[PDB]
Amino acid sequence: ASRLLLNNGAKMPILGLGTWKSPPGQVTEAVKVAIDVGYRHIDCAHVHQNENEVGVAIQEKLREQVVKREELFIVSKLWCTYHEKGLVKGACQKTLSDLKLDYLDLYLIHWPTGFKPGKEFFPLDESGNVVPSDTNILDTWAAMEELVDEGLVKAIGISNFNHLQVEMILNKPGLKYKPAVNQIECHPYLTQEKLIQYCQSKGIVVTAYSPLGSPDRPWAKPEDPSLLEDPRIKAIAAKHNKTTAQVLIRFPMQRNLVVIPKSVTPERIAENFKVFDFELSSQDMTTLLSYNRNWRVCALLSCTSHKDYPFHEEF
Numbered sequence: 001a002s003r004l005l006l007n008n009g010a011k012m013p014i015l016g017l018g019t020w021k022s023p024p025g026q027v028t029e030a031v032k033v034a035i036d037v038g039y040r041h042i043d044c045a046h047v048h049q050n051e052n053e054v055g056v057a058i059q060e061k062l063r064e065q066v067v068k069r070e071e072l073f074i075v076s077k078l079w080c081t082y083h084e085k086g087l088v089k090g091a092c093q094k095t096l097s098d099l100k101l102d103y104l105d106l107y108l109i110h111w112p113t114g115f116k117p118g119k120e121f122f123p124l125d126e127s128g129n130v131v132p133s134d135t136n137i138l139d140t141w142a143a144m145e146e147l148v149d150e151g152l153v154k155a156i157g158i159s160n161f162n163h164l165q166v167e168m169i170l171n172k173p174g175l176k177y178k179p180a181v182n183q184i185e186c187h188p189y190l191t192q193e194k195l196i197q198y199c200q201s202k203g204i205v206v207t208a209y210s211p212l213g214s215p216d217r218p219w220a221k222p223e224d225p226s227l228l229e230d231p232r233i234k235a236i237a238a239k240h241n242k243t244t245a246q247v248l249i250r251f252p253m254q255r256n257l258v259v260i261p262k263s264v265t266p267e268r269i270a271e272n273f274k275v276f277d278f279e280l281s282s283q284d285m286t287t288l289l290s291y292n293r294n295w296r297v298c299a300l301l302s303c304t305s306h307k308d309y310p311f312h313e314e315f
């Protein structure tokens with residue numbers, strides 16, 4: 001539809017606006033335009049370093065009465081340097097301050113990896129490697145569950161968890177709140193059929209991040225594949241008189257995924273909204289799926305020997 005049902009009874013807008021890499025001085029206007037255009041779901045994160053400026057736009061549209069607060073679906077995520085039981089509430093409350101809300105709709109564990117606490121997002125040792133916390137996924141999940149019981153967040157979820165990491169929360173003794181959502185990377189070059197099949201079979205909603213292949217990721221190099229300019233995908237968009245981005249956004253939606261394309265450009269924020277009015281044939285969907293090449297934009301490459309690195313498992 002336009003919203004999917006979560007295991008807590010709330011409904012989550014199938015389209016949201018991503019805000020990673022959105023400069024603090026453009027994102028306020030970006031979020032204001034999104035909300036005006038009809039977006040009702042914004043994907044945030046403390047590590048983005050722009051939640052204060054996202055929060056300025058949200059407050060403005062609330063006070064303008066363009067939207068009521070219960071119409072909005074705001075998501076953020078707990079960064080890896082706050083996995084300690086004693087740090088989780090404090091990280092949540094900081095995010096709530098910057099965003100200027102009194103609760104979140106969904107709050108995700110950003111990565112399954114815990115890092116040493118401190119002021120660096122990626123703490124390094126003598127030899128320049130990332131310093132891990134000795135915390136585990138289950139301790140952190142218990143801290144998250146508390147935030148539901150105190151009324152700070154309505155739902156809790158995970159991001160970049162492999163199927164065995166999800167299983168481990170699912171089999172936790174005394175598990176009180178199931179993960180509502182697993183936000184993972186997903187597009188025609190990394191189609192994630194096994195992990196999406198698993199999560200959907202557990203009643204867990206999947207959100208596809210980097211739908212367009214994150215052409216603005218910091219580590220981009222030119223040999224790299226570009227979805228937005230794949231001549232095969234352009235042909236499919238030509239056939240529907242749509243843009244290739246509009247096709248890349250409609251693709252997850254028809255797999256019953258939530259999708260969160262990022263833009264700070266007003267015409268593109270608008271273009272990206274115009275995806276509810278057409279449909280890919282099953283032939284187009286199969287063709288799109290056949291393009292997989294197991295290519296990840298985000299492989300958290302500095303943590304490949306972390307005890308909790310998610311991407312050594314098949315899925």
Ligand SMILES: NC(=O)c1ccc[n+]([C@@H]2O[C@H](COP(=O)([O-])OP(=O)(O)OC[C@H]3O[C@@H](n4cnc5c(N)ncnc54)[C@H](OP(=O)(O)O)[C@@H]3O)[C@@H](O)[C@H]2O)c1
Nearest residue numbers: 018019020209210211212213214216245261262263264265
């Ligand atoms: N949970 C995680 O670990 C994680 C990791 C990565 C991403 N995410 C979430 O997923 C969101 C989306 O992922 P992403 O930011 O990597 O990349 P993306 O959404 O795949 O691509 C964003 C890039 O595509 C461009 N773009 C937007 N609309 C376009 C259009 N219609 N035509 C051409 N180009 C277009 C943007 O340009 P302009 O802004 O220049 O318009 C920006 O350069 C993030 O912002 C974040 O909120 C989460």
